[PDB]
Amino acid sequence: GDTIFGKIIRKEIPAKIIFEDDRCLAFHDISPQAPTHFLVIPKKHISQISVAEDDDESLLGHLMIVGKKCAADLGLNKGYRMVVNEGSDGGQSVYHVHLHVLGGRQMHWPPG
Amino acid sequence: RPGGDTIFGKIIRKEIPAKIIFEDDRCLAFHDISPQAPTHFLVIPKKHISQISVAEDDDESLLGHLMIVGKKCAADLGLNKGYRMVVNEGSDGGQSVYHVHLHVLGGRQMHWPPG
Numbered sequence: 001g002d003t004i005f006g007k008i009i010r011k012e013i014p015a016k017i018i019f020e021d022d023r024c025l026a027f028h029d030i031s032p033q034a035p036t037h038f039l040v041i042p043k044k045h046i047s048q049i050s051v052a053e054d055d056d057e058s059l060l061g062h063l064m065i066v067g068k069k070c071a072a073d074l075g076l077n078k079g080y081r082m083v084v085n086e087g088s089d090g091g092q093s094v095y096h097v098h099l100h101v102l103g104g105r106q107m108h109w110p111p112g
Numbered sequence: 113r114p115g116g117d118t119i120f121g122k123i124i125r126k127e128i129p130a131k132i133i134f135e136d137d138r139c140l141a142f143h144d145i146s147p148q149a150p151t152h153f154l155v156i157p158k159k160h161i162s163q164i165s166v167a168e169d170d171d172e173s174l175l176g177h178l179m180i181v182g183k184k185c186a187a188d189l190g191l192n193k194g195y196r197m198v199v200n201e202g203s204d205g206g207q208s209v210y211h212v213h214l215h216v217l218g219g220r221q222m223h224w225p226p227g
């Protein structure tokens with residue numbers, strides 16, 4: 001879409017890509033908050049989870065299954081945290097839906 | 113007792129009381145007993161899955177449904193400034209109940225990093 005994540009999807013700027021298929025992309029976060037911190041994003045430009053449609057359900061779930069598989073591939077056998085931010089209170093940094101996966105350290109509570 | 117004997121399995125079968133927000137055939141949303149934000153609820157599948165690391169490929173629609181229900185409930189609860197969704201996986205995630213669930217937190221500014 002019209003965000004930096006759109007540019008990454010279109011391969012116009014670099015990112016360290018972990019996995020790709022026909023409908024999503026996983027890549028390491030440029031500002032990592034844990035020893036392992038990556039994103040899984042849909043190629044479809046959904047700007048934020050609050051405007052996702054019902055028929056996007058399987059796609060959103062796909063982001064989580066891809067996140068699961070990438071986490072295992074990156075050796076996160078002790079677990080991890082998945083995060084989706086919505087809007088200003090959620091601290092959403094880019095208006096393209098993205099699933100964070102963080103691990104490689106103890107995650108704490110509250111989650112921000 | 114379909115769904116198992118974790119506290120969440122029991123909540124699904126109405127054996128333990130909870131403050132329910134939304135219910136359909138696939139999931140249940142209820143308020144967290146130890147809220148970490150002014151609004152803090154959980155969305156859980158009625159199907160018992162212990163954690164994300166063992167979810168099946170065909171669980172995709174269900175997992176997405178948790179997020180769609182999470183976002184709909186957030187709107188119904190007036191979280192118009194946004195919110196954060198969280199899944200805690202395993203020990204490093206700090207998981208305490210091994211029945212998959214999505215947290216939805218809002219009503220205050222959430223901070224970075226997310227724990």
Ligand SMILES: O=c1[nH]c(=O)n([C@@H]2O[C@H](COP(=O)(O)O)[C@@H](O)[C@H]2O)cc1I
Nearest residue numbers: 119143144145146200205206207208209
């Ligand atoms: O009866 C319960 N009701 C609850 O709402 N919870 C919450 O479920 C969460 C369990 O921790 P976890 O890290 O998400 O697995 C935590 O936020 C608890 O306060 C835990 C139990 I046990």
